[PDB]
């Protein structure tokens, strides 16, 4: 019927002054753009069809052509930046925002989807969608006593589009827009659909990725315990963005980090630090590295939760990028920890997996490890036990490697090592 029209046939019907021929031609254009087999986005654009599609969005008297244009434009906006720019250049933003109040839920849903694709392109279009006044009608669609009465796919599209209004960093979304959206985000964070939960956490993940004031706007809304609960979720699409958000929050002030510990996050880390998906282990160890960069009482909480053996674990065997975050976790630990805490580090066996990693080519990880070794040695003198550490480092071939690195031609590995030898190995 309307399957596999030529682009020229589609133009001939859209350029007719017959509304029904235009509807059929527009649906044919929609089916063309619905191919996952390289839809002819460009050819549709070069034919000048976007202004006609945008103008059909306002044909309230003929809701089907509103739906087919919304669908067709959605897919054009789903492509490259230039393809998205063409949809915006045709004036689609104010027309799509008008469709948010449509009495047909399937047209409203499509306009939600389309604005999500436009806002998803980047900061500028995201802020343009906001300036056109999209947030109020979007949030109004969620002003219900119970979210579960909304259609499941409708809710998912709304959450996803809201997710994109929080996304991207240069610049971050407007402060007043984030405050406007956050209460609805907080509610969606408590919904039972895992797709809504994942995209809700992704949204929180975006908002917490910035300076501490942005972190505070989220932390002040009380979402931290719920984030820690979603951290132990079964569905990996939920754990990943929940972990990025928790890890983002512990990049802030010690007080903001403490609320994450207070919510019980450290209890889930034995699983996270051994998780099979390599990216979870990297994110979890990076987060641990930023917790060990905190106060001594916070370092002590890492100790109480039995997480130091798990750091010895990731330092001994893991993806290399995970091992480098483990090195950072150790060095931050030894930079702010007490002498008793640094001695406890030795007794779970940090020293040998630390020295085996001096074998890496990565120049920055060598500075981190050498820095940690120095800090441990500094605690060894306050206990008057520097030699027993040297005997330890020599029996695992560490001293064998520490003075071999003096012939490294980055030249702080040059000297930080040579100091290490002529102060503790002479």
């Amino acid at each position: 019927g309307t399957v596999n029209w030529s682009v020229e046939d589609i133009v001939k019907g859209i350029n007719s002054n017959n509304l029904e021929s235009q509807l059929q031609a527009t649906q044919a254009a929609r089916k063309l753009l619905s191919r996952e087999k390289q839809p002819p986005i460009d050819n549709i654009i070069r034919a000048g069809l976007i202004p006609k599609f945008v103008s059909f969005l306002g044909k309230t008297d003929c809701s089907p052509i509103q739906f087919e244009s919304a669908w067709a434009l959605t897919n054009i906006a789903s492509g490259t930046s230039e393809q998205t720019k063409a949809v915006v250049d045709g004036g689609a933003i104010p027309a799509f925002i008008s469709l948010l109040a449509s009495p047909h839920a399937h047209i409203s849903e499509q306009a939600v989807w389309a604005l999500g694709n436009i806002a998803g392109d980047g900061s500028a279009f995201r802020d343009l969608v906001i300036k056109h006044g999209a947030i109020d009608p979007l949030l109004a669609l969620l002003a219900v006593p119970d979210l579960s009465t909304l259609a499941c796919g409708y809710l998912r599209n709304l959450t996803w589009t809201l997710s994109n209004l929080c996304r991207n960093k240069n610049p971050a979304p407007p402060l007043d827009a984030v405050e406007q959206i956050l209460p609805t985000l907080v509610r969606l964070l408590h919904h039972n659909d895992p797709e809504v939960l994942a995209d809700s956490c992704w949204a929180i993940s975006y908002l917490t990725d910035g300076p501490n004031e942005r972190i505070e706007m989220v932390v002040k809304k009380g979402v931290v315990p719920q984030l820690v609960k979603l951290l132990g979720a079964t569905e990996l699409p939920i754990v990943t963005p929940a972990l990025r958000a928790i890890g983002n929050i512990v990049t802030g002030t010690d007080e903001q980090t403490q609320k994450v510990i207070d919510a019980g996050a450290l209890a889930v880390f034995p699983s996270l630090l051994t998780n099979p998906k390599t990216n979870i282990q990297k994110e979890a160890t990076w987060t641990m590295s930023n917790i060990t960069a905190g106060r001594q009482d916070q370092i002590q909480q890492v100790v109480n939760h039995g997480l130091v053996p798990f750091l010895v674990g990731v330092l001994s065997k893991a993806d290399f990028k995970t091992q480098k975050e483990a090195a950072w976790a150790i060095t931050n630990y030894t930079s702010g920890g007490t002498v008793e805490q640094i001695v406890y580090l030795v007794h779970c066996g940090i020293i040998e997996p630390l020295m085996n990693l001096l074998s890496a080519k990565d120049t920055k990880i060598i500075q981190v490890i050498l820095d940690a070794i120095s800090n441990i040695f500094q605690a060894a003198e306050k206990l008057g036990e520097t030699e027993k550490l040297s005997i330890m480092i020599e029996e695992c071939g560490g001293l064998d490697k520490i003075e071999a690195l003096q012939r490294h031609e980055n030249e702080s590995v040059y000297k930080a090592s040579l100091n290490l030898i002529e102060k503790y190995f002479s």
């Binding site: 990049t251 002030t253 990076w286």
Partner: peptide, 8 residues
């Protein structure tokens, strides 16, 4: 503000 914290 803590200087020992790190971003990705």
């Amino acid at each position: 503000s803590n200087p020992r914290k790190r971003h990705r």
